[PDB]
Amino acid sequence: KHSYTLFYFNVKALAEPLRYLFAYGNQEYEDVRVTRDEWPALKPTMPMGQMPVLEVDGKRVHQSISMARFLAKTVGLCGATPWEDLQIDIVVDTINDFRLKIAVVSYEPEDEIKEKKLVTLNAEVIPFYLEKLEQTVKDNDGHLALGKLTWADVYFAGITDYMNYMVKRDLLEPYPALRGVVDAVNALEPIKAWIEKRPVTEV
Amino acid sequence: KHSYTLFYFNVKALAEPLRYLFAYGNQEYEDVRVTRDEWPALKPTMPMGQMPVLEVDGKRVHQSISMARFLAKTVGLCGATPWEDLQIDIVVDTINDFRLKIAVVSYEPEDEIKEKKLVTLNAEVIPFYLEKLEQTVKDNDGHLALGKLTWADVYFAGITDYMNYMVKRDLLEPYPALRGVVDAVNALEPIKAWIEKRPVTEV
Ligand SMILES: N[C@H](CCC(=O)N[C@@H](CS)C(=O)NCC(=O)O)C(=O)O
Secondary structure, eight states: OOOEEEEEESSOGGGHHHHHHHHHTTOOOEEEEEOTTTHHHHGGGSGGGOSOEEEETTEEEEOHHHHHHHHHHHTTOSOSSHHHHHHHHHHHHHHHHHHHHHHHHHTSOSSTTHHHHHHHIIIIIHHHHHHHHHHHHHHTTSSSBTTBOOHHHHHHHHHHHHHHHHHTSOTTTTOHHHHHHHHHHHHSHHHHHHHHHSOOOOO | OOOEEEEEESSSGGGHHHHHHHHHHTOOOEEEEEOTTTHHHHGGGSGGGOSOEEEETTEEEEOHHHHHHHHHHHHTOSOSSHHHHHHHHHHHHHHHHHHHHHHHHHTOSSHHHHHHHHHHIIIIIHHHHHHHHHHHHHHTTSSSBTTBOOHHHHHHHHHHHHHHHHHTSOTTTTOHHHHHHHHHHHHSHHHHHHHHHSOOOOO
16 A cells, blocks of 8 residues: 655664664555665755655655654654643643754764763753653653653653663663563564664664 | 633744634634743743643643644544545654754754754755655645645645744745635635734744
8 A cells, every 4th residue: 555665864863763663564565765875866865955754646845853753743652632642742842842952962073072062961851851751751650741652652662772872871760660661562562673674773 | 512721932932823723713823922021920820831822621731833733623624534534643753754854953052063064955955855846746636645745744834934934035936736725724814814814023
């Protein structure tokens, strides 16, 4: 019925939550891993010249969070009403805001102003977001939204390795409830099979 | 029969798209405008300490793009399928990405950094985003998505003044199709009535 192709670099990073959602839904897709050398040539064929991109029946889309939301709908990992969908959207937006704050410091400045912001990141931002999310999980019985499995859980499990990579430590060590969410997603049979089969990469 | 309260500062800025959507749907709501003085005392009661905040039957939510998507569903400004909704989501994410890039410059700390970034913003960032959106509108018969009125149009019409305020000029001068989308939303009877009604604020 539907043809799916994912374009990204040979890394997990922002595409890995999409790869998780495809695995979750038993959905065959072509996992195109563009080399650094080949990227100049393929860039003009990507919307806005960025990745990840999905091509769905020949039509290309971008914006990884919105594509994750779409894939979640196709696999029943959303809610039943606009209100429920909003609750999931909010927590994913919060996770993304957090990811962006880490990225801006880690991948951000070339010079060593990184030093001062990294202090603010570690001392204020990281503990602040992770404590909020930890409480959310406790308030929702081991889930990020709606007191049940949703794509917020799958997104978070799919993005945590990247966030860890960017700060160079296990961010979830102090947060057993958040670790519980990630472990529970990673233990789902098709996601487990994907993790075992996927290309081993640093990022 | 549902009770809606919007909390924000006494400005248009980030909440104005939400106010447009309430107007569009003829949905009564409490427009709570938190003055600069009240804010530090009120802040600790708000989710993640930010605004805008929507209260729906007492339940507080935040994240303005996700709240706009929720109001859009409530007033009928979405698509027919998840695929169609994805198209609208992507363009709003793009608009938000652009707005954030403006904001990073506009509120920049040291003046030597602000000035360097402003150069890049004007020469590279602004044309990159707006040229693409301009072409999109031309490819969608005067609309940002689905060749018809969607909440992407309403969002864009409701945020344009804020982007212009931050750069201190009319960003849409080179982009007549984009101005057309804004004028067409602004001319919609319920929106026109709101624009005339609303408090006059600098932002
Ligand atoms: N995630 C943003 C939140 C933006 C936000 O945090 N709002 C600002 C002002 S527009 C704020 O209340 N920040 C703290 C403050 O100004 O006291 C959204 O799209 O709603």
